[PDB]
């Protein structure tokens, strides 16, 4: 099965369409399991979420060569890891990766080729105004965030860079264009 | 030079507590050891989830995976295939833990061909027949399958005294005995993965 990676801004609502996704299409897809240095959230899981790992074993991870990709976000090491994705096409499900724009780039240099989906929010003042709203996680972290949001929105505009583009108005609307952007590839796992 | 921490190789016959004894391992030692989950062409039992207590994936995709190579090692169990991906092993070192892995008597014998060099365990029951009730008991058998767990179970008993298989056979007949017993056995092993 193709790859899907998924990316656009973090906050957008990429995160909450791919769990509604996997939730829907039992058995169909499968979710990549990132590496990442960061603290784990209440409630995220590790070897589901993420590989929730130290730095000195994430640089030892990508020392051995373990990543297909690897970046920074926030201070923090992410990485999509050779055994996360071939975890999944070890179940003939398809890969659903959820990564930044650098990693966007450095998987079209890989032999993955996936499908490019884009996550947009309507506008940057619209995605803050729905992440302030939420509250919940500190200023630092939010305009962190929301400034890593500016350079992912801009390079949509990269001819080719994405085969989809879809603005989040609704989370409902949203996971409508996702459904029809893979609804070819759903049918034939199927 | 001495060795450093192995992976752990637990085997006997499933409803002998293994597997509730490996559970209780891995929640109490997180941070020290790592599943490897096994693919398996059985059908999903409830409570079981699929990437954690198997790769539920059918005969089809698991024979195409182990064509590709996907495969430390795999059996044939009571119909339906068995097996510890490439993946599965590698997933937990790049968590920096030791793998434990849960395996029937023919993946012992398959493991001992391969690289891992780990340690072996056995966990055995007090009896056939109190391993025949503990199955019935649990239920989620066919008879069919009943009964050919309980002829591979007498196989595994006898596999116990093989000189040189096992490296410790426990006899679980209390949980708490058997963990007591299995961390005692550990021990080294335990201490050896603190210090890396
Ligand atoms: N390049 C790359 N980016 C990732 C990876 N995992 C998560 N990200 C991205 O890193 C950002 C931060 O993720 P969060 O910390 O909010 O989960 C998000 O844009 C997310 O998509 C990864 O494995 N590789
Ligand atoms: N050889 C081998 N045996 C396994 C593997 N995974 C589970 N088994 C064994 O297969 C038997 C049946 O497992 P169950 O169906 O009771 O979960 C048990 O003895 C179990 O330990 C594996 O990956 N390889």
């Given at each position: ?14 995160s909450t369409l791919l769990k509604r996704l996997l939730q ?7 979710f ?159």
């Amino acid at each position: 099965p193709r790859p899907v990676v998924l990316s656009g801004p973090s906050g957008a609502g990429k995160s909450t369409l791919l769990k509604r996704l996997l939730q829907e299409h039992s058995g169909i897809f499968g979710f990549s399991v990132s590496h990442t240095t960061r603290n784990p959230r209440p409630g995220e899981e590790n070897g589901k979420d993420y590989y929730f790992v130290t730095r000195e074993v994430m640089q030892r991870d990508i020392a051995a060569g373990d990543f297909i990709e690897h970046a920074e976000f926030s201070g923090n090491l992410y990485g999509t890891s050779k055994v996360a994705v071939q975890a999944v096409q070890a179940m003939n499900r398809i890969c659903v990766l959820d990564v930044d724009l650098q990693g966007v780039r450095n998987i079209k240099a890989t032999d993955l080729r996936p499908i490019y989906i884009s996550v947009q929010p309507p506008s940057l003042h619209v995605l803050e105004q729905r992440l302030r709203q939420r509250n919940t996680e500190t200023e630092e972290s939010l305009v962190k965030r929301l400034a890593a949001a500016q350079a992912d929105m801009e390079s949509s505009k990269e001819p080719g860079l994405f085969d989809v583009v879809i603005i989040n108005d609704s989370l409902d609307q949203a996971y409508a264009e996702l459904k029809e952007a893979l609804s070819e590839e759903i049918k034939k796992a199927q």
